[PDB]
Design a protein around this nucleic acid. Structure first.
Lengths: 56, 103, 48, 142, 150, 110, 117
RNA sequence: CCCGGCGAGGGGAGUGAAAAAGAACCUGAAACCGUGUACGUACAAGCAGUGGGAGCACGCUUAGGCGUGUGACUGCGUACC
RNA sequence: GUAACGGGGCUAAACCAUGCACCGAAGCUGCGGCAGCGACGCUUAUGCGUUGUUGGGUAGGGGAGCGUUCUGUAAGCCUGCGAAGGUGUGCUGUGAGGCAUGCUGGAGGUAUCAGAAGUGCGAAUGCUGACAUAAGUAACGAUAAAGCGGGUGAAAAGCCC
C-alpha cells in the first residue's frame, strides 16, 4: 500500500526479535581422538565412533 | 506538634522543628520572627477554640535566609493566530526555622 | 584618542521596522500587510 | 509549605465482610464502590488506590427491585450474527454469582487503569462459603 | 546569470515545486535574490552646519588642552628621522600634525612613525581632528583654517 | 590487555553482520571461534578474519596470555555507501545503494 | 556585507533541545518536533499552574468528610455549624490529623454540630 | 611485529609538539546506525506532554531530608505552520 | 453494542410544595513579585516617596533592545604564559540575550558608543548534500537448463579440466 508516518527505530529491532540466530547449546569431541567434532555428522578422518569412513 | 498562623493574605500550617519558606519579610537573619496571629494549635489533642489569634499561644521562629528564588517563565500561546508570548518573574522569599509550638 | 563617543539628539535615530523576523515576535508572517488581497502580495496592479 | 500526599507503602486497607442477604443490588453497590475507592476513608491523594480489602459474604440472592430487572439483560456483541446478543438477569446470580456485584461497582470507577486496580480488591466468591477466615473480617451491616 | 532562459517546469501540480525558471534565486547556487550593487553613500553635506561643527571641535581642543601651538613646527629636510627626534625632544607621542603651508619637508615626514600622522589645514578633516593625542598646529595653519571656517 | 581489529570497507550490509556478531557476543574468544568455524555461511567467514586478527595480536606484541582472553565488545557500524542505478520496469532508473560495513571486534583479558 | 545566517540560532536551538531533555524520540533529537513540544509543554504547565489547586481542593474536602462522618456529622452541616459558631477562619487544607494522629479533630466538629440551628 | 591471497582493513611497536595532526591527514556539529553503562518496560491502554509520585545508581548531601539522572505508577489532558 | 440522565446505581437516592446548607472559576479578596501612566509631595536635565483605576488579546500600528556579517576608537591593548570554533554544565536577565567554566581547540580576539547590511529558517507539495524510511519487505533478466570427479585458488553451486 503506503504508510501514514515514518516508523520508529525501536520498531525495527522488535520486528527482528524473533528472526535472530539461536544458541547451539555447546559442542562435541570424539570418543576416539583428540580431534574435535561436528555434532552428529562425520569429520574428514571418519571420527564419530572411531573406525574409519570416508577418507576423502 | 502542628499549628496554623497567617503570613499575610496566605495562611500557613507549620510544625515544631520545621524550616519553612514564606512570602517576603522585611526582617533580617540576625533578628526574631514571632507570631501571636496563631489561629489555633492542634496540640497533642483536639482543640476547642472560638476566638483566633489565641492569646495563650505563640509560634517562635528566626530568619535563616532572606533571598530571591529561581526564575520562572510564563508561556502564553494560542495557535493559528500567531500569538506567542513569554514573560519572566523571579519572586523574593524568606526561609524561617520554627522553635516554638508548646506541648 | 577621543573619536567614537558621538551620539544623536533624543529620538532623532528612529531605527525602523525590519519585518519578516521571528515567529514569537508578533511581527513575522504577512509582514504588517494583513491577510490576502492585492496589498498583502508584492507590488503590482493598480496605477498611481 | 506543601501538602502531604499518599504513598503505596502507607496504605492500611483492613478486612471487611459484607452481609448481602438483607440487601438490594445498588445500596450495597454504591456504598461498596465508595469504600473500594477509599472515598469512605481519608485518601488525601489523587493517584494511590487506597480502599478496603472486601469480602462480600453471599450476593447469590440479590434482588434488583421492581420491573427494571427483566429488561436488564447485560448486552454484548462479541463479533458474530445479526442481532444484539444477550444474557439473562437469572444467569448472573444463578451461575457465577459474584458477577452481578462485580459489574455493578465496575462503572463507578475512573477510566481504565486505576479502576482496574480498584476493581481487583473485591471478591464475592459463590456465596456463604468465603475463604477469608484467617484475616478476621469485620462484619458490616448496610 | 546568462546561458539560459530555460523553464525546468514539466508543468506545476505534479507532486513538486512551481519550477518556474532555471535562474531563480532559490536554484541552489550561481546567484542570490538581493546580492550587492555598487554603493555611493556620500551626501551633499550642509556648509553652515559643517563649519560650525569644526568651531565646536576647535573650541574643545583648547578647552581640553590638546592644542599645544608649537611656533613654526618643521624639519630641515623630508626625513622621518628628524621629525621623530624632534617629537621625543618635545616629549610627545602619536600627535596629529597640521601643516599650514604644505611644505614638502613636513608633508613627506611621519611615514616611518607608526602612530604619528600629518594633515593640511585646507578643508581640515573632522574625523582625524577629534582623534589623536594632541593637535600640534602651526600659527600659519590657525590662520588659514579660521578663514576656511568663517 | 586489549587489541582492536577493525575491518573497514567490508563487503556486507550491516544488519547481516550484526545477525552473526550478536550470536557470539560475550561468549569468550575460543568457543565463539568454534561456533564461527562451523557456520558455513558467507557473512561468518567475513567476520572470522577480524575475530581472528583481534585474538591474534593478543597472542603476540602487547598482549600476554590468551586463556583468560574474552571478547569485551562485538559490534558493526555503517561504512561509506555507494549509489548505483538499478535497471527496472517501464525504463525506471531508481537508486540502489551498495552498502559496506566497518566491523569492530575488541578482545581484552578484562 | 554577506552575513552567514544561523550563529545566533545555534544558541536558541541547543537551549530548546536541552529544555527537550527527558522527552521521547524526535522531540529530543529533531529541532522541528522539539519546538512543537516546548510550546505545548509550557501551555499545559500554565493551565496546570491554576488547575493543580482546584484538583487538590477536591481531596482537602474529602479527607475532612471521612473524619467528620466518623464524628457523626455530614460535612456541609459541620461547616455551617462552625460558620454559626463564633469567629475562627479554619481551612480545608488544615487536617494533617485526618489520615495520621487521628485521635484529634473532634472538638471543633463537636462544637459546630451543637451550634447549628 | 600480529591476522591475510600474494589481498583489503585495523591494531601493537616506533616517529612528532601534536597522529584525541595517520595520509580521504585542517578542528568538527546535526541527521544516521550501532556499543557500554545506569534506571525502567510481562493489571499491561490515546499527540507521549503536564501536574502528583514508590524506588534505585551515583554524589563521605559537615547525613541534616539535599544534588545529579532515570522512574513503577497514576489525577489531568486532542500536534506546529 | 446499553448508547433519548454522560455513565454506574436509584421503584426513592424519583418527581411535586416550601426552604436551608454546602461545594463551585485566573471572578470577588489578601499576600509576594511586576508593567505603564493619572493624582499629590519633594522637586528634576535625569528622579524618587506616598497613592490610584489599570495590565486576556490577533490583524495592524507605534516605541525600545539584541546577536550575526563588516567599518570606525583598533597602527593601540590581550594571546601558545592557551585565540575563534565544537560541546556538557552552572550562574544571571523581562525576553531576545549576557557571563563564568571542565572537556575539546592549536591561532586568533575584544568592549563602551556611532554607522553600513546579502542580518536569525521550519515549512514555499522551494533548490543540493549526507543519509534515513516502509525492509531485510521486493529482486534472481526468455528454466541457449545440468550432473558428479579432479584442479587453479586463501576460498567453488556459477570459473578451469
Amino acid at each position: 500500500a503506503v504508510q501514514q508516518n515514518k516508523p520508529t527505530r525501536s520498531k525495527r529491532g522488535m520486528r527482528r526479535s524473533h528472526d535472530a540466530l539461536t544458541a547451539v547449546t555447546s559442542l562435541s569431541v570424539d570418543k576416539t581422538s583428540g580431534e574435535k567434532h561436528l555434532r552428529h555428522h562425520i569429520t574428514a578422518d571418519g571420527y564419530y565412533r572411531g573406525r574409519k569412513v570416508i577418507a576423502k | 506538634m502542628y499549628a496554623v498562623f497567617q503570613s499575610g493574605g496566605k495562611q500557613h500550617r507549620v510544625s515544631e522543628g520545621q524550616t519553612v519558606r514564606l512570602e517576603k519579610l522585611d526582617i533580617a537573619t540576625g533578628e526574631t520572627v514571632e507570631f501571636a496571629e496563631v489561629l489555633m494549635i492542634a496540640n497533642g489533642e483536639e482543640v476547642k477554640i472560638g476566638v483566633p489569634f489565641v492569646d495563650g499561644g505563640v509560634i517562635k521562629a528566626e530568619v535563616v535566609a532572606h533571598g530571591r528564588g529561581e526564575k520562572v517563565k510564563i508561556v502564553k500561546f494560542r495557535r493559528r493566530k500567531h500569538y506567542r508570548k513569554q514573560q519572566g518573574h523571579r519572586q523574593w522569599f524568606t526561609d524561617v526555622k520554627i522553635t516554638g509550638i508548646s506541648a | 584618542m577621543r573619536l567614537n563617543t558621538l551620539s544623536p539628539a533624543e529620538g532623532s535615530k528612529k531605527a525602523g521596522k525590519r519585518l519578516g523576523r521571528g515567529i514569537g515576535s508578533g511581527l513575522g508572517k504577512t509582514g504588517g500587510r494583513g491577510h490576502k488581497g492585492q496589498k498583502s502580495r508584492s507590488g503590482g496592479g493598480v496605477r498611481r | 509549605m506543601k501538602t502531604f500526599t499518599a504513598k503505596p507503602e502507607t496504605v492500611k486497607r483492613d478486612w471487611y465482610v459484607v452481609d448481602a442477604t438483607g440487601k438490594t443490588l445498588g445500596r450495597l453497590a454504591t456504598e461498596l464502590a465508595r469504600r473500594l475507592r477509599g472515598k469512605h476513608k481519608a485518601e488525601y491523594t489523587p493517584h494511590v488506590d487506597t480502599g478496603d480489602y472486601i469480602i462480600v459474604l453471599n450476593a447469590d440472592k440479590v434482588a434488583v427491585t421492581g420491573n427494571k430487572r427483566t429488561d436488564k439483560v447485560y448486552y454484548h456483541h462479541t463479533g458474530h450474527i445479526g442481532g444484539i446478543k444477550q444474557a439473562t438477569f437469572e444467569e448472573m446470580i444463578a451461575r457465577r454469582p459474584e458477577r452481578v456485584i462485580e459489574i455493578a461497582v465496575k462503572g463507578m470507577l475512573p477510566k481504565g487503569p486505576l479502576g482496574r486496580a480498584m476493581f481487583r480488591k473485591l471478591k464475592v466468591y459463590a456465596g456463604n462459603e468465603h475463604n477469608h477466615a484467617a484475616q478476621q473480617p469485620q462484619v458490616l451491616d448496610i | 546569470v546568462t546561458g539560459s532562459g530555460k523553464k525546468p517546469w514539466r508543468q506545476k501540480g505534479t507532486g513538486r515545486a512551481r519550477s518556474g525558471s532555471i535562474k531563480s534565486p532559490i536554484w541552489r547556487s550561481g546567484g542570490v535574490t538581493f546580492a550587492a550593487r555598487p554603493q555611493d553613500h556620500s551626501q551633499k553635506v550642509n556648509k553652515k552646519m559643517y563649519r560650525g561643527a569644526l568651531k565646536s571641535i576647535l573650541s574643545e581642543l583648547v578647552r581640553q588642552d590638546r592644542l599645544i601651538v608649537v611656533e613654526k613646527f618643521s624639519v630641515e629636510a623630508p626625513k622621518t628621522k628628524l621629525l621623530a627626534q624632534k617629537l621625543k625632544d618635545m616629549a610627545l607621542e602619536d600627535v596629529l600634525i597640521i601643516t599650514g603651508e604644505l611644505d614638502e619637508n613636513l608633508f613627506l615626514a611621519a611615514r616611518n612613525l607608526h602612530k604619528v600622522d600629518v594633515r593640511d589645514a585646507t578643508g581640515i578633516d573632522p574625523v582625524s581632528l577629534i582623534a589623536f593625542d594632541k593637535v600640534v598646529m602651526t600659527a600659519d595653519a590657525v590662520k588659514q583654517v579660521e578663514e576656511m571656517l568663517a | 590487555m586489549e587489541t582492536i581489529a577493525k575491518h573497514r570497507h567490508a563487503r556486507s550490509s550491516a544488519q547481516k553482520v550484526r545477525l552473526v556478531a550478536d550470536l557470539i557476543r560475550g561468549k569468550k574468544v575460543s568457543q565463539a571461534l568454534d561456533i564461527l568455524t562451523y557456520t558455513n555461511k558467507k557473512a561468518a567467514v567475513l567476520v572470522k578474519k577480524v575475530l581472528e586478527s583481534a585474538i591474534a595480536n593478543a597472542e603476540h606484541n602487547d598482549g600476554a596470555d590468551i586463556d583468560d582472553l574474552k571478547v569485551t565488545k562485538i559490534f558493526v557500524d555503517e561504512g561509506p555507501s555507494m549509489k548505483r542505478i538499478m535497471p527496472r520496469a517501464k525504463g525506471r532508473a531508481d537508486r540502489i545503494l551498495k552498502r559496506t560495513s566497518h566491523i569492530t571486534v575488541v578482545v581484552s583479558d578484562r | 556585507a554577506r552575513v552567514k545566517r544561523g550563529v545566533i540560532a545555534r544558541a536558541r536551538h541547543k537551549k530548546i533541545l536541552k529544555q527537550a531533555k527527558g522527552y521521547y524520540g524526535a522531540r529530543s533529537r529533531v529541532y522541528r518536533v522539539a519546538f512543537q513540544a516546548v510550546i505545548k509543554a509550557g501551555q499545559y504547565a500554565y493551565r496546570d499552574r491554576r488547575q493543580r489547586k482546584r484538583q487538590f481542593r477536591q481531596l482537602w474536602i474529602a479527607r475532612i468528610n471521612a473524619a467528620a462522618r466518623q464524628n457523626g456529622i455530614s460535612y456541609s452541616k459541620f461547616i455551617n455549624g462552625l460558620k454559626k459558631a463564633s469567629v475562627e477562619i479554619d481551612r480545608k487544607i488544615l487536617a494533617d490529623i485526618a489520615v495520621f494522629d487521628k485521635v484529634a479533630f473532634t472538638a471543633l466538629v463537636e462544637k459546630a454540630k451543637a451550634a447549628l440551628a
